[PDB]
Each structure stands twice: as C-alpha cells, then as structure tokens.
A and B are shown apart, each in its own frame.
Chain A
Amino acid sequence: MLKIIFFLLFLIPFCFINNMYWMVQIMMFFISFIFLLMNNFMNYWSEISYFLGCDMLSYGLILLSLWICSLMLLASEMINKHNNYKNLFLLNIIILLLLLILTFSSMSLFMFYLFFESSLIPTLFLILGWGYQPERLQAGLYLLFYTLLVSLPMLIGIFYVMNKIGSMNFYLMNNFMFNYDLLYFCLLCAFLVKMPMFLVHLWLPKAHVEAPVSGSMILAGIMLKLGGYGMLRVISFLQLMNLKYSFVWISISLVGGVLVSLVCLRQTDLKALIAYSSVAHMGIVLSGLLTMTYWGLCGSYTLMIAHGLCSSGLFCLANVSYERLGSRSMLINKGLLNFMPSMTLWWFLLSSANMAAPPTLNLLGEISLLNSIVSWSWISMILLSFLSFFSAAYTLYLYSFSQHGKLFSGVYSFSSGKIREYLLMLLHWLPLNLLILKSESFMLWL
C-alpha cells in the first residue's frame, strides 16, 4: 500500500496552502476511487511491498476508513467558515488516516500495535480542540487512559509471543497455540476495552457526546473496529484459552446490549443514544467473535463494516440538527419533520439501518452473527430475542420522537438543509444498500 501512503504523504503539504480544504476532500475521494480499483485481494496477504500488504479483511477496513475520513471532511464545514484552524484540522485528519491505513496494512502485529497507539493522539487532539463543551477534558482523558491502561500489558504479551515464536507475522503466528491465562488476558483485554464491552464501555459516551462530528465519526465508524480487527488477528492462536474463557465474555456481552438497549430508552441526549447504540451492535460483534465459527467471523466482519457506516451516518444526523437548534436533546429536537421534511427521509433511512433494514448490509451482518450465537448454545436465544426487540425499541424511538409530533415552540429561525448535507447523508446510506450486491468482499475474509 505504498502508492496510497505516498499519495497521502504528498497530500500533507496541501494543508499549508490556503483555500484548499475541498481540494483535499476531492483528492481523498480520488484515493477512495483508486482503492476501489485496487480490489484483487484474497484470503492471504497480497500486494506485498516493505512490510505492507492486505487481505480482504484489511482491504475492507482501509476502504471503510478512507470513506469515513473523506465524509468527515465533507461533514465538517463549520471549521471552514469560521476558519477554526482548518490547516491543523486537515493535517490531523491526513496523519490519522495514514496511521489507520498503516495499522490496517500491517503484516506483523507490532505495526498494528504501534500505529494503533499512534492513532489515539490525533483523535485526542480532535476531542481536546474541536469540541464545544467544557467536558472536553473529561472526554479525551477517559479515551486515552481507558485505552492505555489495557493496551500497555498487551505490549508485554506481544514481546512474550515474539520470544516464543520469534516473529510477529500473522501467518507464522497462526501455527502456534498457547495455554497461558495471563497471555490471553493481555491479548484480549485491550480489544475488549477498545471496542466497548458492557463493563468497560464508560469512555464511549463521554468521548462521543463531547467530540466534534469530525471526531465522533472516527470513533463510531472506525477505531472501535481496531478492537475487532485485533481479535480477528489474535483469536487464531489462542483458541484453547478462548474455549476456556469465552462464556464469561459472551454472557457479559449478551446481557449488555439488553441492559444497554434499555439504557437508550431512558436517555434524552441524541448523541448519547447513538453512543450507546454503538455498544449494543458491537456487543453482537463481540459475542460473534469469541465463537470461532466461520459464519461468526464472516458475519462479524460484515457487521463491523456496515455498523461503522450506519453509526457514522447516524452521527451525521445528530450534528445537522445540533447546529440549527443550538443544543441537542430529545426535548428540543422533538418533531423535526415539520422543520426539515427532506432530512426526515435520511433520518429514517439511517435509523432503520441501525436496526435490521431489509436490503442493507446491517441485516446481512446481523442475520449471520445470530447464526453463530444460536449454534453456540440454545440458552442464548432468550437474551438475543430481548436484545433485538429492545434494539429496535430504542433505535425507532430516536427517529420516532425526534421526527414526529408537535414542534418545540421556543426555537428561533435557523437555516434549512443544503446540498452538502443531503450528499453527506447519501454517501452513508447508498454504500449500505450497494455493497450488498458484492457482499462476498465484505463477508469472506477467509
């Protein structure tokens, strides 16, 4: 992936040239176009050049990250009009895109760890610099410390695996297997916190409500997918310890996602409800990963890609209504159909995508992740039916109470929808309904 990385490395000096924000967006969408034309990847590692290569898993993750970052520039126009350090913001986005491409193109696990910890810094910069509330300092510190406290012993695990095997390459590490409990806990707890388990989620709504949309989308669409891609790499050589210790994580991640789904029914903040919605569907992803079935891994990767697209799309809607109504809640934003009627179509087309939407990739990820949990045990049926029922109970309450009913009758005059916002909502929904025609690039990574 040297051409993409050098393209972005020479896209770096466009930040220092003024009035070039949309030019950087145009060339990043050109990168996404070229990366659409680079698809020839299969199971093993292809296009190998200077420790960089990808399989279908990493191809889909780089394509998702490139699509999210280009949309993020399109989403963040308030940086451009107020001139709120747009050069520093563009440089942060391009460097974070380099770090996410480099942690996804890693043939060895230590580049994945190194650029995975490097990607925490521009996200922390986005949190601490481009928010709007005094609790920015509470947000980036929770993100940084909840990531670092569990990601620091995983470095000791990495060096323990390296001494035992002698290499970090993902195929040479597939041959070995380990029967150590603490090695399993080090190599799992960092991904178990980085993608939120119910007991360790805390940092997620604090990082999401405070964060700017260009900063909430990179936490929702990706960077929870680092904690899924890490398990997709790690569980291959820790299968016996995973069969010893899966049931506690499956029980926690299936009780959460019901409790988490009951939380969203009793919350009024629009950005916090999508923040807890990221916990519940990747509770399904986390439950499907630790069952090592082939359908579990394939449907897990499908729901990672599709859930990233629909959660970033749902966080797109929560900032359009925020900048027009001054502050977001359920009470202020009640019934926006009479204010913005054309925005309501994307509101339902992306809130329905958060649950099982019929021609989207969210349903195809969800229909095959339920297969692994049902084939795992029949006890899990009771707490899956409640999970999906309460899932579409809360995610239809979002559209339901925000887009129907009487107006607030205390709001002032705001601007209407623009060409940028409808184009922004289109590129989150129509990829969810268009990649189902070639879902094997997002199902089969094996």
Chain B
Amino acid sequence: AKWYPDPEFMKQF
C-alpha cells in the first residue's frame, strides 16, 4: 500500500 507503480516502472515498457 505504501509503494505503487511509478512512471519509472512505466518507463521500461
């Protein structure tokens, strides 16, 4: 709940 997918996770795709 504290961490959610950031745009840095979105960047690799």
Whether A and B touch directly in their complex, counting CB atoms under 8 A apart, is answered as yes
Smallest beta-carbon distance B13→chain A, Å: 13
A133 at the interface (CB under 8 A from B): yes
Residues of B within 8 A of A84 (CB): 1
Complex interface bits, A116-152 against B, C-beta within 8 A gives 1, otherwise 0: 0000000000000011111010000000000000000
Residues of A within 8 A of B9 (CB): 134
- The answer to whether B1 touches A82, judged by C-beta atoms less than 8 angstroms apart, is yes
- The answer to whether B3 touches A133, judged by C-beta atoms less than 8 angstroms apart, is yes
Sample of 13 A–B contacts (CB below 8 Å): A78-B1, A82-B1, A84-B1, A130-B1, A131-B3, A132-B1, A132-B2, A132-B3, A133-B2, A133-B3, A134-B3, A134-B9, A136-B3
What 11 new A-B contacts, CB under 8 Å, besides A132-B1, A132-B3? A78-B1, A82-B1, A84-B1, A130-B1, A131-B3, A132-B2, A133-B2, A133-B3, A134-B3, A134-B9, A136-B3
Q: By CB atoms of chain A within 10 A, which of B1, B2, B3, B9 has the most?
A: B1
**B contact residues, total (Cβ < 8 Å):** 4
In the complex, which residues 1-13 of chain B have their Cβ closer than 8 Å to any Cβ of chain A?
1-3, 9
Interface size range of chain A in the complex:
under 10
State in angstroms the CA–CA spacing of A136 and B9 once bound together.
12
Q: Which A residues fall within an 8 A CB radius of B?
A: 78, 82, 84, 130-134, 136
Nearest-neighbor residue (CB-CB) of B2 within chain A:
A132
State in angstroms the CA–CA spacing of A82 and B2 once bound together.
12
Nearest-neighbor residue (CB-CB) of B6 within chain A:
A134
Residues of B within 8 A of A132 (CB): 1-3
Residues of B within 8 A of A78 (CB): 1
Give 5 closest A-B pairs by Cβ, nearest first: A132-B2, A134-B3, A84-B1, A133-B3, A132-B1
State in angstroms the CA–CA spacing of A407 and B3 once bound together.
28
Smallest beta-carbon distance B4→chain A, Å: 9
Smallest beta-carbon distance A325→chain B, Å: 13
Smallest beta-carbon distance A82→chain B, Å: 7
State in angstroms the CA–CA spacing of A130 and B4 once bound together.
10
Smallest beta-carbon distance B5→chain A, Å: 8
State in angstroms the CA–CA spacing of A82 and B1 once bound together.
9
Nearest-neighbor residue (CB-CB) of B5 within chain A:
A134
State in angstroms the CA–CA spacing of A78 and B2 once bound together.
12
State in angstroms the CA–CA spacing of A132 and B1 once bound together.
5
Nearest-neighbor residue (CB-CB) of A326 within chain B:
B2
State in angstroms the CA–CA spacing of A218 and B3 once bound together.
22
State in angstroms the CA–CA spacing of A130 and B1 once bound together.
6
Residues of B within 8 A of A133 (CB): 2-3
State in angstroms the CA–CA spacing of A312 and B2 once bound together.
23
Residues of A within 8 A of B1 (CB): 78, 82, 84, 130, 132
Nearest-neighbor residue (CB-CB) of A212 within chain B:
B1
Smallest beta-carbon distance A328→chain B, Å: 13
State in angstroms the CA–CA spacing of A78 and B1 once bound together.
10
Smallest beta-carbon distance B10→chain A, Å: 13
Nearest-neighbor residue (CB-CB) of B9 within chain A:
A134
Smallest beta-carbon distance A84→chain B, Å: 6
Smallest beta-carbon distance B6→chain A, Å: 8
